Amino acid sequence: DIQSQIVSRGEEILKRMESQSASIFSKDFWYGSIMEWSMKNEKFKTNMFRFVDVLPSINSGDEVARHLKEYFGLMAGAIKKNVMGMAKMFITGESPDEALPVLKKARKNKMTFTVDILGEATLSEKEAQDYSNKYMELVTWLAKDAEKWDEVPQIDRDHEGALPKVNVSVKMTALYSQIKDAAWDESKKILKDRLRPVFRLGMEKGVFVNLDMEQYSVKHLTLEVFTELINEPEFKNYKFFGIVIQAYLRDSFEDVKSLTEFAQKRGTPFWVRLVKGAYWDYETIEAEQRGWPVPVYTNKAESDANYELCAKYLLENIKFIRPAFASHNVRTLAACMLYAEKLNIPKEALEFQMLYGMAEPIKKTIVDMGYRMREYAPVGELIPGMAYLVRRLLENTSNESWLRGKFADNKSMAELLKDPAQGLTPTSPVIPKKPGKFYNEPLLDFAVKADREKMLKALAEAKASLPVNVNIVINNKELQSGKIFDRVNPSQSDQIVGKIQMATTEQAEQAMQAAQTAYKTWKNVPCEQRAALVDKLADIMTRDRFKLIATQVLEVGKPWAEADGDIGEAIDFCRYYARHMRELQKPLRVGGLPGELSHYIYKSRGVTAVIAPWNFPLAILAGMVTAAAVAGNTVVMKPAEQSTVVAWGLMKMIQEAGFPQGVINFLPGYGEEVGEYIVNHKYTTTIAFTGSKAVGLHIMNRAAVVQPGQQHVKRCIIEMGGKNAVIIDNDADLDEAVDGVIYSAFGFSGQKCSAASRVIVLDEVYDRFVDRLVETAKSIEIHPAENPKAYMGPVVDKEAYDRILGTIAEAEKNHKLLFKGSVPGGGFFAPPTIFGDVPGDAKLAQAEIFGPVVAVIRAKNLDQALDIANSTEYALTGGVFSRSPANINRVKEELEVGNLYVNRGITGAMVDRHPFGGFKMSGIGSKTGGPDYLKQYMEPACVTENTLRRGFAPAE
Amino acid sequence: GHMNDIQSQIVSRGEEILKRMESQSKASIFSKDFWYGSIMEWSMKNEKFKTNMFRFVDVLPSINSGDEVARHLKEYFMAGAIKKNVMGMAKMFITGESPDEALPVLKKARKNKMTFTVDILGEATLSEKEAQDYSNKYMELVTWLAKDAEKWDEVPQIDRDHEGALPKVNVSVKMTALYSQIKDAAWDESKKILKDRLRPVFRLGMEKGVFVNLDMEQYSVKHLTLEVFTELINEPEFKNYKFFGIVIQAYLRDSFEDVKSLTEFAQKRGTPFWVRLVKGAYWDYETIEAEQRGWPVPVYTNKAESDANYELCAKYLLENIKFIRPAFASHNVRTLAACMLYAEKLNIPKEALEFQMLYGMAEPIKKTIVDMGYRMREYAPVGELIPGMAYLVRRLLENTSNESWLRGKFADNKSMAELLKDPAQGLTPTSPVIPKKPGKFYNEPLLDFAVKADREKMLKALAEAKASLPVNVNIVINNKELQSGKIFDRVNPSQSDQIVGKIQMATTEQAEQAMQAAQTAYKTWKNVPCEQRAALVDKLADIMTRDRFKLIATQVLEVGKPWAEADGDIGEAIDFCRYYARHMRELQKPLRVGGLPGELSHYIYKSRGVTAVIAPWNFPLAILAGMVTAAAVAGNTVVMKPAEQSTVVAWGLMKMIQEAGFPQGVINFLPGYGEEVGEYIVNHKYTTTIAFTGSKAVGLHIMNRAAVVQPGQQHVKRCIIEMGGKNAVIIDNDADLDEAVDGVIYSAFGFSGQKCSAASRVIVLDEVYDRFVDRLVETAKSIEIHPAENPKAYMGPVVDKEAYDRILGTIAEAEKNHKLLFKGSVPGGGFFAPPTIFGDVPGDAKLAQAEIFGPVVAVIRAKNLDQALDIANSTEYALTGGVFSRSPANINRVKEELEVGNLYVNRGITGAMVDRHPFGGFKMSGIGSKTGGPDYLKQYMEPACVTENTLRRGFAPAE
């Protein structure tokens, strides 16, 4: 019934399109030929779109020719003119001045506009303020010129009266650089505060203001910002505010119903610009990387059908809320028309929107049919304009593109116009897990209000339990020494979090004896049962997630999301090493000769001493302990005195999991006392130590000593830190580079063996990158870790505080200071600090600081950048931001690090994804979360059996 | 009829034979109305039962208590009952335990128109005492049986052929039972000794009118047996006697050529002799042995090939019956019927033929052949329960075989047409070459010194090596030869007044030049693609293969390695080359990890830097080559410091490395003193990795030095260390003593015990102590000690005068504390330390704890497996260990409780091969060294991860 009428209207529209005078897919222009070649070859598509992406960042003809050769001086004029020429198809002007006559020419053709100022990512508060100022000026200046405009009723009036002649679209995240979902209300208040002057200026000038919709991670926040703002009294009576809804989202119809109910309660209409959505590939990739549900439909017919249903619902409620239909899809457009006519809605009530330069024959047909047509009108600089051009290239060459089906794939009219609900196969947001494959634990989404509330509840309960009395635990019995160490809250140093019983060397001897006794039977516990215990530990960690986070927040100063990642990593180690042991338990047939069975197997070693750091207080400790234990060894663990409350929780979970007495023993105390004792003991077969270089070198000297009565060779598994650099190539995407460097350098206040402490920046890009880096570093917030708004918290203790401040003062005598942030008092808050033009051989660029202190180093070219990057004692992490295939390959082959990253930050290594560890003085034998690690806790062995007796051997 | 319808006439004869068989009242071995037949039915239906039942039968006569029989029964799946039942099956196939017991059986067979050939069953001849006893048994048998046969009446069907009278007494002799030290490399000496031991038996038989038949054993002695036999019976005193016989096995690929060759010889001899034509008894053994050795398979592997070759051989011998006399040994009615017809087409009278079958086998067929008027001779085994239960196992194996003709007839109910068809019809040949599975690693085959051409090349290579002495060895840095002026003279350890090498011993300044050359070279070598580095290592292996004999000779003369030990050394060196090259070709491939969209992540390996290689002398090419090629193929450069005792060997390695084409500085050759330049490269700031194999004392020192971070050192040193063992073999009460003694002798005295894997402790349970130790001592008395150049050497000298004096001092101290069971005699002129065995050594005694690295064994008593394991586990070391046992539960306990890195069950504990037995251990035996296995190459590398964000402008490429 109504479905047959929609098809009929689509047929009328396509017939009219046949009468128009060409299509963007035309292969007689550069844009069409680019697309055809891209659609024919997936490697060409990737290389072509990446080349276009980097092109406006290249500032010499030789460098354009070099990038051209790698991806596939007067070739720069030629190629760049053609490619920048394609951008002019989709960008109305480089500035409001250039765009104005284009906007007026469209008005003469019965099309209006909505202006959007293109920009790079807002990473700093300076950039946010500049974007806000651009919008204030645009609204004032365009409203002023429009005072002289004659009225064009098809575009300037609807069925109710006059419409604003000027319409601007605003990108919410461009207005504030420090959105933080864990600090939901504070972030929400700030966004409203930044949006309010723009909406107010627009209202005062009679301008339409549309708030765009960005990626899913800010979708819920944008809707709360928008509705709360336009419900304020000064705005409550203005109809000409709008919000975007993306029909490709699974929750979008629910938002449409919610916005409709809100419009009724508001008592004044506002507008919904209904789109399908711009971030589809991005959303599927992000959700899979995070192990989160996929927020978009993944069958395109679902998106089309939900768009049409959303359109129908809004039209049904047009008295309260006003839809505008943004789509180039003739099926979609025809469906909207019929749903409107079924309701006797007049043509002048509707509004259609299309991108400038897109779907010209369809655009003209809609106008000829009497409908109001509004063009999305981008304005901006060459660099964001080329990003925009790439998105057009990506959409138009998509396999699901309706326009591609019409103008390139020669699809039938029936296929183009069919009901998306027909033959509809639904998709699920849950990505199926491949059986046998390892998956990382998903991290918390603090945009979920229930998770913020559980976090605040877990923090309150932790605070009420202070101080935590921690006992020594040997053979599952709690012991005391009488020597108590007070561990204060590093964010508030007058509060005691833990009172730690510090063991004597006699108790360390008892721990050694208990582990050696237990090893006699634990080494014969079957692998599956050892693995099952490790699995139960991971389940307990999963159950107690919020309590575990709260302990790390308070005792170690780890910010909420850092603490959560620690718990996920701890769970990951458990599951990964349990999975690995289940594989390695199987004897490996070797040789394969008849008459002789020979198998390669692994054996446990004995008592393992575990000496763990504080900076990943649950994850690293748990990885060492579970790997050693699941391999059939027993464990004496000596946790860091700064994080012994965290380790105490681990011991309690180990006891609850059911590890037999003595298999794992909990030996808190001083490293120079009981740590030294278990390193030196004759029963210790394996030492796992992650910490400073000085202690590691000392441990390795001690472990080489064969103690009286020791009948084995000790093995050291050692990680000792880094002096890690990120290289910034001249053609780097500075949005990605600045964001990655900031988080790599200042995440957990730089207290990571993987932290970026060196940024090696090539000379041509130095000023632009360093200015954005400094302005972004000025914008990050430093708070007690308990405060969800903290980007950085404190460093671990007073000793580190004093040492770091000492390093900063020393460097100020030697190097140009670019930035030093302000920090709160009351705890060990070291300030984020950046020095510039630091020599590559300077002490600041050589010695590990483990604090929020960055050395920016200049390089003439990639040759010098690599030499500088390789010139330290360390070889742990390193990275490059580059859009040159040959430079990326040079970095891959020549940068001497154990974990190399291209075009992302250099921290956050995850189990299985990024096995972690390096060489030089960064360690030996420690590649955690990878397929070699567990074997370090074992001995290989070979069992060879002659099966031939009396001239006969059984077959295998 | 038709022209060339012989196959139809053979089928007809077979149909007559089977028809007559239906009229007999004789039992089949396959009848499930006996215990034997029911065992077989269950065995043919279930392979796990077949294995367990045959192994149980094997071990039963070695068990000496009722409780232990019940224990073995429970473990494999009533001692009087089971042993009585199993011994009953043995008496079906063994005429008697002694000649006296067998005599009435032989005479009863005669009354039923069948004659016999007597064979004395025995265990392996491992010692000269056992060889002498075997000889005496035959001399007594021949005299006594001939004497009793003087009173026998004549039975013409069996006592006459077509020419005249035949011997009434016929004995069969197993050649290797007469001598315990056959050594193919000393071919002529072994052949003379075998002939000397056979000669009195052949002579006594001839004097008594007795037929003497020489059996044919496994392929490794087939050619030797034929030379022994033909030369013996062509000697003046024997060349006129007709009643000697030799066995030919038609399942051998070369048997038709041997048949033709024996016929020519019979003509030249001028007096006939006999060929007993069989198919062959060692089929499974030969295919297993040849595959394990990488040698061509000497048997056909299609059973119809054996049948067809049998008939071809039979026709040829019949065609030449004037010169040589065939006897047809087979239970197969097709085979028998073909022989009958081939004889009839040649107008040969029936009385000229002779058919032979095993006692107790094929009763219905046997009786039918006799009724048809043919002469039938029964193979008549005589012997004790233990060899008799071995023989019963061979009968069970043959009768349950899928290819057995008797099984096809009496068990598988195959049609008469299938049973009688021409084996040549549609016959597809097999190849002696086993196809290599692609991508799989194979070990290099060792030389077969039974091949005369290979002995000649060995003697040629030794002559050329000796004429080149002394070898002047230079230091080689950056492919340039250097001298120091400090010369170390390395004497021939078999003849200590002869200098083999004059070695330039490097200075520390030259060690610095070696370190600098390696570090400079590392800068470019680390970027040579894996495939090209692996190809250089493959070329090195090819050069080693080409120069095999020259490389053996160097090890024989400089290190005292006996021929076969040195050959095994070259094979292991080639194996290291190919295995590490193969492994690097696998590890070059980046491993995708995580697999998330939008981010490529790969796990890879990197080289480490300059590698110091400090190699021992006891495997002078193999271990050194494995360290060097593993390091280099992984992308590292190398400074190698060879042992002063074996630098001429290592000099040969360096020359091959240069010839293979390794660029200058990638590998540097730094001879000298370990405490001088070895220490220097261990301590140097550029050295990233140290591979050392040697003594515990040096290993601990090196690990101590390597932990120091030197000035300018910006890395942590890795040590790859192997440090020796105090390795034990446990002898369970039920051990197969043939295997146990042989395995322990070679494990203890091979290369005079100078192996880290050598058995220096033998832990023997009390019940079997006296039997095992007596055979061990007697076998140890029989092995020969010679200069290594002599192919008859079982052991040669120890490495140098220091080791000699140290070892003789240990022997002298131990003689004051422990019972001396045996000390061998040794020649002079070199460092010949005697093989020495002490008995009842306490497990905690110094002799049973400190590694000696010499031919010195401590035999230790154990009350039970509990104490045996406790003693075995009580040392500083955990390298190799082994057990001889036929108890499944005891074998499992050793697997789970013996603390060693290389555990062996029912074989020797030395001879670890690349890929087959990855080698290395724990406690004080080493750390990080499991050579020739899938973890080893990674020790020379660093793991790394490369992670690339592929998402740009909201798009990422698919993989």
Ligand SMILES: *[C]/[C]=[C]/N1=C2[C]=C([C])C([C])=[C]C2=N([C][C]([O])[C]([O])[C]([O])[C]OP([O])(=O)OP([O])(=O)O[C][C]2O[C](N3[C]=NC4=C3N=[C]N=C4[N])[C]([O])[C]2[O])C2=C1C(=O)[N]C(=O)[N]2
């Ligand atoms: C920021 C700015 C913006 N906006 C806008 C505005 C306007 C005026 C317009 C017109 C637009 C826009 N956007 C974009 C949109 O959304 C879209 O993307 C476009 O437009 C295109 O679409 P259409 O045309 O309708 O076409 P079609 O073809 O029909 O479709 C396409 C689509 O679909 C989907 N998909 C794909 N694939 C798939 C899907 N789904 C499911 N599944 C699958 N497989 C997607 O979506 C595509 O696209 C926008 C805006 C805003 O604001 N925001 C957003 O998001 N967007």
Ligand SMILES: *[C]/[C]=[C]/N1=C2[C]=C([C])C([C])=[C]C2=N([C][C]([O])[C]([O])[C]([O])[C]OP([O])(=O)OP([O])(=O)O[C][C]2O[C](N3[C]=NC4=C3N=[C]N=C4[N])[C]([O])[C]2[O])C2=C1C(=O)[N]C(=O)[N]2
């Ligand atoms: C030392 C002792 C001995 N000898 C003898 C003597 C007599 C009188 C007789 C009768 C025998 C003998 N031996 C054994 C023989 O050789 C045989 O083995 C038996 O006998 C059996 O055969 P006959 O019966 O014919 O059956 P038949 O079934 O038809 O056949 C079987 C056979 O075949 C073969 N195979 C198996 N499988 C196979 C084969 N081939 C190839 N392929 C395959 N797969 C085998 O061979 C069997 O067996 C003897 C003797 C001597 O001296 N030596 C020897 O070696 N043997």
